[PDB]
RNA sequence: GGCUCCUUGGCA
RNA sequence: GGCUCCUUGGCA
RNA sequence: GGCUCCUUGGCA
RNA sequence: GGCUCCUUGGCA
RNA sequence: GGCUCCUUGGCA
RNA sequence: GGCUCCUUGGCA
RNA sequence: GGCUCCUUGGCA
RNA sequence: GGCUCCUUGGCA
RNA sequence: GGCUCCUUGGCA
RNA sequence: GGCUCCUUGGCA
RNA sequence: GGCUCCUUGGCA
RNA sequence: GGCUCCUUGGCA
RNA sequence: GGCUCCUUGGCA
RNA sequence: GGCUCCUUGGCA
RNA sequence: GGCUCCUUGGCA
RNA sequence: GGCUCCUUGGCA
RNA sequence: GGCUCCUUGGCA
RNA sequence: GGCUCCUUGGCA
RNA sequence: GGCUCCUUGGCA
RNA sequence: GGCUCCUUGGCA
């Protein structure tokens, strides 16, 4: 239902700081949850599942997105762009979201919010290409 | 352009006193998070953090002297680090705009804590500066 | 025999419309006969005799029923109640029906049919009182 | 509650066009015969009859125009009077429920005459209304 | 017959206000009857009998319901819940309703209406337990 | 959130002027009956009732002055108490949203009585407020 | 949008030096652009179009302004006044500016800046008369 | 009034050495651009330019001698022409205010180029003048 | 050198 | 060593 | 970037 | 979204 | 909802 | 038509 | 007879 | 009527 | 109308 | 305009 | 001193 | 000080 | 002292 | 909570 | 509940 | 020969 | 055909 | 799509 | 954005 | 920018 957006925001913060600060994912999860004053169970558990599905499988995801960068190493992107793409790939593919378009909207929203419009368009294009590659992979 | 630099430096010093890691990496992190564009803000904030880190023990002594008997370790991270930054710029960088420094610092205190801590930091800073004037 | 009920129905319609519409009794008789598709001679002639015995003697009848209304003017009743009482008095008294109870049953039936149950009980009571007054001159 | 009112009004108009007496007395007669209980049915039917009687000649003209050349006097009493009522309510009372008016009227035609007259009255009424739409 | 529901509603209002406002039961009965525009005799008299059977016997009833609250004092419930339970016990037990299920339906309906769903479920459970205790008192 | 508070206060004042019991208990009763959830509505309505009860005689005087010669005791409970509440909030609480107060009050009058009383209360309230503007 | 003022300044320099130094318009354009450190494309192209529209049509313009000098030969004016009037006529008439008043403000500003107040008033009056003559063909 | 005349003359000589056109026309252009009002400034600057143009080759020789082996064609236009003007006024016009000439010239060098060229021109000019003193 | 001041050059 | 006003030019 | 005025759309 | 409002309903 | 009075269907 | 119910319709 | 909620539409 | 979010262009 | 900004000059 | 530090003038 | 016309700073 | 204004800090 | 827009978070 | 769209049932 | 309707009845 | 009411079922 | 009450889940 | 709401921030 | 009250600047 | 002053600079 509705908790999904908040869960995605939390997960994005956790991944962003995990990449940037190199701190433990669980500890950063505690930090983000405490500072955001998260209470409701669904959002908490969904965010935890998102973060866990992002951390486990991280390299597979990195490879997946690095395939669509046209030979460009993933460190050549922005922190926001990169991590948001990671979360997006995790949710869309690894958890097989039944609401792909919704995930697109929310993710792109997060990218616009934390970075800017152009980053949003970039992430949108890349992730769209990735999902187009995924859906017809079967 | 100095205000944002002061906010930066404050956050960096805060994370240093909290986590305990290397100030440079923390600086990189804070800079990355707030998206610092302007060059002067970067340079300035960096100079602030460096100045604070080099003189840190002397700064702590100067602050503790005006704490009215308190141990500096017992202050809140916000008050303590804001006082650190304030003393750093006012004394060791010899800021030619002390009033503005007081402004920015106290405002920072009121942002990340209650105004109750704001007037306190203002008072301690005032005492420290008044002592610094008659020092030399 | 059997034609009596139909004759009574026809006569009742004729009287009801005579009182209500103020139209000529003979013309209304033609109307009712034509619209009911009456054919059989006995019913036709019996209905005609009923209507004629109702029209001639009408005021005498009105007085008779008005005696049993306990001072109440006859216009204070319903059209159905009034006219049915008129027909009933005509048949019972003026033609001296040899089948009084039968006339009662049929008349009360007509009253229930064209108005309602309570009107039927009312007409029944009134007409019964009238006939009780009529039979004992002895 | 409108249906019974329409049946009432139809019977009244019919007896008016037939006998030729005063519409009010006829209305009283019809009301007495069918035993009208509800107030709204009475009021409504009365308004219908009044509206029809006031505008009667104009109504006859409007109807006759769509008769395809026929004289309105040559129509059956049922068809003619039902058309009268229909035109009265649809046009002069500006009914906001035209479809329902068509329904009730045509049904009335099918009750007191064959459906053969029903489709006819439906057609004439449809033509009249379609003309009324583009009138103003 | 049908007047029972209305009677129960009236009685419930009277009890609710009797408990809340502390005003005289008869006066409040007059108030509720006047404001609801109650006319029909059966509803009036039935409501009066319900209220009277509720007021007289009130403490006995209170004890009865307080037995099933598992040691919980009756003032710990809501006004609606409490008073509706009082009326329910009065009707089911003291007047020995021959239509227990009907009383259940109507009472629970009143509880849902004046409070909420959960209050309805609560009252339902409690009253059901009470009636289960009553029927096998034989 | 103010509207429900005004309805509350109105009902409370009404029951006070009617029964004559203690306003606090009546307030508890009304609050219990309407199931007030929100805190601000409770607090507000309570402040309204208190303000009205404290200043009640002065309020009655102010209202009676604009009644055009009538005795305030001769007004309907609805009109009288609604005027009481209106004057209380508009004058003694110095409401910064007078138009909205007029709205809510007049609406309350139209709910528990005819609109005929509504325009009247609106007029009296308008006169009172216009007088209050030029008072100080 | 905003580039217009800068374009007008550049054009004015080019015309002033074209009249004074007699050097090639394109070369002087290169000089002014290089020395002003002009980069943004809109300003560059707009200035180029202004200069080109001034050079081509130059004699027509000269005649136009010479009509409003009341028989006075155009060489009797100042360099600033003359050339600014040329640019003004070019922009207002030949390019048909949709922002005439704006052009007036900027041109008069340039005249005040490079010469003095009185020159500004003079140019203002003359150019205003010219535009008044231009706008009314009917 | 001499300073502006020197700036004028410098610009004129510069444009001469750059473009290669006739010094008189260039003088007219520069005078027109800077809006020279005062008569003495005009006359003076004109005398400076004329004196420089007449003696130009001798001036170039004198300058080149003190260049420490450099070709005069390899100097920046600013340094070269400022030196030209300086030598012209100091030597051929026999200025009675040499210090002031040094001032104005060096300042002109610092305006249209970096001070790095300023000290250089000052040095060369000093050498040239010191040589001129012992010449006769 | 004890007063009131003014113009002005270089310079952190 | 720190500013004021303003001009031109580059971008949010 | 911030404020504000229209204007072409999709709106709440 | 959201007030006044001339009009027709829907649910209870 | 609540209130006033009358039908229909079906079950005893 | 003695009398209970279920589901609906219309109604001041 | 009197309420709660809500939809469409006519006008500012 | 008042309030407002975006979007296509042009302004203070 | 404003503000910041990457550059270069005139005035105090 | 302030201002740090060396100057040059010159007025009552 | 006197005379002709233009700046700068600061105060209303 | 009589006009047109702009930037901006603290504050109920 | 009363708002606008928006972000996050808790619930109907 | 309000509107609305499907969907699994019991329905009127 | 509730219209059209191809079909079979029931009651009167 | 023609009406009132009502049940089941075929189709939108 | 149109209207509608609840209920199991998923949406704007 | 909306509204209210228990919390905390950015913009005007 | 409004706004109460003390300010600082600065433009024609 | 309406208009008064104070102190200076340059100038036929």
From Swiss-Prot, chains A, C, E, G:
GO biological process: DNA-templated transcription termination; transcription antitermination
Keywords: RNA-binding, Transcription, Transcription antitermination, Transcription regulation
GO cellular component, one term: cytosol
Pfam assignment, any one: NusB
SUPFAM superfamilies: NusB-like (SSF48013)
Keyword DNA repair tagged: no
InterPro entries cross-referenced by the UniProt entry: NusB-like_sf (IPR035926), NusB_fam (IPR011605), NusB_RsmB_TIM44 (IPR006027)
Top-level taxon in the UniProt lineage: Bacteria
UniProt entry tagged with the keyword ATP-binding: no
Any one GO molecular function term: RNA binding
Function: Involved in transcription antitermination. Required for transcription of ribosomal RNA (rRNA) genes. Binds specifically to the boxA antiterminator sequence of the ribosomal RNA (rrn) operons.
UniProt record similarity statement: Belongs to the NusB family.
Record protein name field: Transcription antitermination protein NusB
Species annotation: Aquifex aeolicus (strain VF5)
Lineage: Bacteria, Pseudomonadati, Aquificota, Aquificia, Aquificales
Gene that produces this protein: nusB
């Amino acid at each position: 239902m509705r908790y999904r957006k908040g869960a995605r925001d939390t997960a994005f913060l956790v991944l962003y700081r995990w990449d940037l600060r190199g701190e433990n994912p669980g500890e950063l999860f505690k930090e983000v949850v405490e500072e955001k004053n998260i209470k409701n169970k669904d959002a908490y558990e969904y965010a935890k599942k998102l973060v866990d599905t992002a951390v486990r499988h991280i390299e597979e995801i990195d490879s997946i997105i690095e395939k669509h960068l046209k030979g460009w190493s993933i460190d050549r992107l922005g922190y926001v762009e990169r991590n948001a793409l990671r979360l997006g790939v995790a949710e869309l593919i690894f958890l097989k979201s039944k609401e792909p378009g919704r995930v697109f909207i929310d993710i792109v929203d997060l990218v616009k919010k934390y970075a800017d419009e152009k980053a949003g368009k970039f992430v949108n294009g890349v992730l769209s290409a990735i999902y187009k590659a995924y859906i017809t992979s079967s």
